[PDB]
């Protein structure tokens, strides 16, 4: 049985926003039909409550969930179970889907990637599909649902002639498109990092490579639950979703399949990049140790024999071999050049 | 039947037999005084702080009608937390923890609970625990503990243990903060040793916290007749607290693993730098050693007299070859 969680050092019933963004708050509603649409932006929640019992589909979008009062009021007026609200306010979560007899609750993730600082930031977006309302919950201004807004505003496509199910499909489709553009950004970043890794192998290069590794692991742990959500969307059809609009969900599922495969290929490529880095650094170390060993090989035996002739037994044939010393230097040079020739034979 | 642990120093048996009207306590070391408490209708709490003294634990085992196998379970220390259900009593194995801020060393102590009808029994290996708030609540009639049965006493004990786990998590949180700051900027061999030790501590903590979640889940989900149905939400709360602790442990594990990965990422550069240093120092000294050795040879025909003053020219060529090698090392950025 579903139940609100008790948390230590926190009053029993309180709901907490588990996030970092508290800058801004906004409520945006588009009530659209076949004939006419209306849209407005507001802060009052009473201005948007009465749409619960409305005929034409409406899209209530709430930006800024640090306002837990607004989330609680909306959930109470719309009859949302408190655990679903607690899931909404929790952002340390994976994408999920939950089916209820009156509404369906979906958790998705949005990603903005920056070339500078190579930072992959996630924003959680929640969708509640009700009788004729799709509830949009976000943390901060800036989303990817502008195409759906434009289609609603200029009667493009077929969205104006359908119900809220098509609106849910459209929002999820736009989010998957953002996933595609993020994957393209990852292409660009991999290209830059692979160009730099071959000729400039340093510590910041491998810091960037491991950052990319962690980013891709997070992307995989995000895409797999998304694929499960879409699979449950089209192949366990709830009463809220019509018999139509299921092919569209299947298309979104196919797109998720493609995204997952691309993520796996990215992981393989980045592993190859790390191997390339290690090979390059090892080759430089080989070069330096090669010069060290050539010097040591040429000089240590020669220093040894210089020490042999630098000692004193008082009964040694030290002279009279055509002064001997020129012969000693001749032997020095002969063995030195033989060692040089051997190194050339080894191509060092 | 042997105490497998290390703490075999101190012994004392505390008793807190309590009821709404009044409460009675006595700290005694004689076995016979703590026996007849199973017949008391009022809830009773017996605390045996000596485990190496196997005589007393065996005596209370055959006096309370508890199987010798669970007696061996108390006498065994290297054992993850577990719960067992018997028709007459319930057997629970738990662990306490002590963390030293200075030494970064985490040590564990086992506490074993045998809850029978209207009586709870502990078993500790050492003096010192965290059940003191439960004792104070039993004494000065603070909460609802004195007005309820022994299963509520078990709940209070487990709640105190989970609270101690929260405090330990606070200490580990401070340690991870400082260690992450030190590793990110200005790392050191001591910092790597600290990182390894903290990773080991977190591994132990995860391995001892997951069975605790399992135990609390089995406690509230399917309730044996020993636990009343009214006390289920309390054990449920403790289960939620254990969930919180395990989530924090997992997050800390991820942070520490990333800290290790970033450090080990850059070892080959260290190899290359040590190679460069050694090669520079060896290359600019072996030829000089050679020429000094040749001119130190004990032959008799060495023009070591006059000849442009002798040592000035050899010092000059040593300096010239040294600076030439230095210039050659200036290329390629050595």
């Amino acid at each position, epitope marked *: 049985e579903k139940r609100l969680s008790a948390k230590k050092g926190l009053p029993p019933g*309180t709901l907490v926003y588990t996030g*970092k963004y508290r800058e801004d708050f906004e409520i945006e509603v588009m009530n659209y039909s076949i004939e006419e649409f209306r849209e407005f932006k507001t802060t009052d929640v009473e201005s948007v409550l009465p749409f619960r019992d409305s005929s034409t589909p409406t899209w209530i979008n709430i930006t800024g969930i640090h306002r837990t009062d607004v989330v609680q009021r909306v959930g109470e007026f719309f009859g949302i179970h408190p655990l679903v609200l607690e899931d909404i306010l929790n952002v340390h979560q994976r994408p999920k889907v939950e089916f209820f007899e009156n509404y369906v609750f979906i958790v998705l993730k949005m990603f903005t990637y920056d070339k500078n600082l190579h930072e992959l930031e996630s924003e959680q977006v929640s969708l509640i599909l009700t009788k004729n309302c799709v509830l949009m919950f976000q943390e901060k201004i800036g989303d990817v649902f502008d195409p759906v807004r434009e289609r609603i505003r200029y009667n493009r496509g077929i969205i104006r002639k359908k119900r809220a199910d098509y609106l849910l499909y459209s929002l999820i489709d736009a989010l998957v498109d953002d996933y595609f553009v993020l994957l393209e950004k990852i292409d660009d970043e991999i290209d830059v990092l692979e160009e730099e890794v071959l000729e400039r192998p340093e510590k910041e290069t491998v810091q960037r490579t491991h950052q990319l590794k962690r980013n891709l692991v997070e992307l995989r742990k995000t895409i797999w639950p998304l694929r499960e959500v879409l699979s449950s969307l089209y192949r366990d059809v709830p009463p809220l979703i019509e018999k139509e609009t299921v092919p569209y969900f299947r298309d979104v599922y196919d797109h998720t399949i493609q995204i997952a495969d691309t993520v796996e290929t990215f992981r393989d490529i980045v592993s190859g990049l790390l191997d390339v880095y290690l090979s390059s650094v090892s080759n430089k170390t080989n070069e330096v140790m090669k010069v060290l060993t050539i010097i040591a090989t040429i000089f240590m035996p020669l220093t040894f024999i210089a020490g042999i002739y630098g000692m004193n037994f008082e009964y040694m044939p030290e002279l009279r071999w055509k002064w001997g010393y020129p012969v000693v230097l001749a032997v020095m040079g002969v063995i030195a050049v033989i060692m040089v020739v051997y190194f050339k034979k080894k191509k060092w | 039947l042997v105490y497998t642990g290390k703490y075999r120093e101190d012994f004392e048996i505390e008793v807190m037999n309590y009821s709404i009207e009044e409460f009675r306590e006595f700290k005694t070391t004689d076995v016979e005084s703590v026996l007849p408490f199973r017949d008391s209708s009022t809830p009773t709490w017996i605390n045996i702080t000596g485990i190496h003294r196997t005589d007393v634990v065996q005596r209370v085992g055959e006096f309370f009608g508890i199987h010798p196998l669970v007696l061996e379970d108390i006498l065994n220390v290297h054992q993850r937390p577990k719960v067992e259900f018997f028709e007459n009593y319930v057997f629970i194995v738990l662990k306490m923890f002590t963390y030293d801020k200075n030494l970064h060393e985490l040590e564990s102590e086992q506490v074993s609970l045998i809850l029978t009808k209207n009586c709870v029994l502990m078993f500790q290996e050492k003096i010192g625990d965290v059940f003191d708030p439960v004792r104070e609540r039993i004494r000065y009639n603070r909460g609802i503990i004195r007005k309820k049965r022994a299963d509520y006493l078990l709940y209070s004990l487990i709640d105190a243990l989970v609270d101690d786990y929260f405090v330990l998590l606070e200490k580990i*949180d401070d340690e991870i903060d400082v260690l992450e700051e030190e590793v990110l900027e200005r790392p050191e061999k001591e910092t790597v040793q600290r990182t390894h030790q903290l990773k080991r501590n977190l591994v132990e903590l995860r391995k001892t916290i997951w069975p605790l979640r399992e135990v609390l889940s089995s406690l509230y989900r399917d309730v044996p007749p020993l636990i009343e149905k009214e006390t289920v939400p309390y054990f449920r709360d403790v289960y939620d607290h254990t969930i919180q602790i395990a989530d924090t442990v997992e997050t800390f594990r991820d942070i520490v693993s990333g800290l290790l990965d970033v450090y080990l990422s850059s070892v080959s550069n260290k190899t290359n730098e040590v190679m460069k240093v050694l090669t520079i120092i060896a290359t600019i000294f072996m030829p000089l050693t050679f020429i000094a050795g040749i001119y130190g040879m004990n032959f008799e025909y060495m023009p070591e007299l006059r000849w442009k003053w002798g040592y000035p020219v050899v010092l000059a060529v040593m300096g010239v070859i040294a600076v030439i090698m230095v210039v050659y090392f200036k290329k390629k950025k050595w």
Partner: antibody
Amino acid sequence: ISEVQLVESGGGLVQPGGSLRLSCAASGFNVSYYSIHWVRQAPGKGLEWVASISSSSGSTSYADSVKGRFTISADTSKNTAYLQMNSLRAEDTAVYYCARSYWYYIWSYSYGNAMDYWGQGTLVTVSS
Amino acid sequence: DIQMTQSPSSLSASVGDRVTITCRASQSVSSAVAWYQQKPGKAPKLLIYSASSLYSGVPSRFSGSRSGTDFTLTISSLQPEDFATYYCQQSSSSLITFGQGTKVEIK
């Protein structure tokens, strides 16, 4: 609708050992969704936290300096939090602020609260 | 009761300087530390929460960080309006406490 405002009322000169009650009217927000705090600042001294109420759950917390001597409570219908001060001492003389806070998140086990909106504060004088 | 020890208590600096206020806890306070500023005759104003996060509407010159049980508030570049008393606060326990204050004076 409207800005978030906190207004205190009830500050007055009370004889030592007596009693008085302070009101905290909440505007711009619902007292249930938030936690109301009382903060005491003695003349010439720093801030001291004195009380706390979580109206929706009814949970209360008191400082040891006033524990067993103060009582904090709220009316959800009136959108007002209260502070019943009795058995006052000479050291209770201070300006009493009313504040609103939210809970935020650090780790799974750790939480913290920060105070956003403060009232003007009313002065209580225990003397003569 | 966790004690917050805030030092210095009588800092003085000129406009455009750099102010550092350090604050220490008697025991572990897991990054649940906030900073407030109070001009004389007024109510406190929130500056930093979670020891690092900057409150909305607070000027960007204010900054905070945590080093274990040690917390610091920095005014990177002083302003004429940046002269007031600053306080600590721990909120890891149900019993929450303040620091004793730190007055930044005009030099």
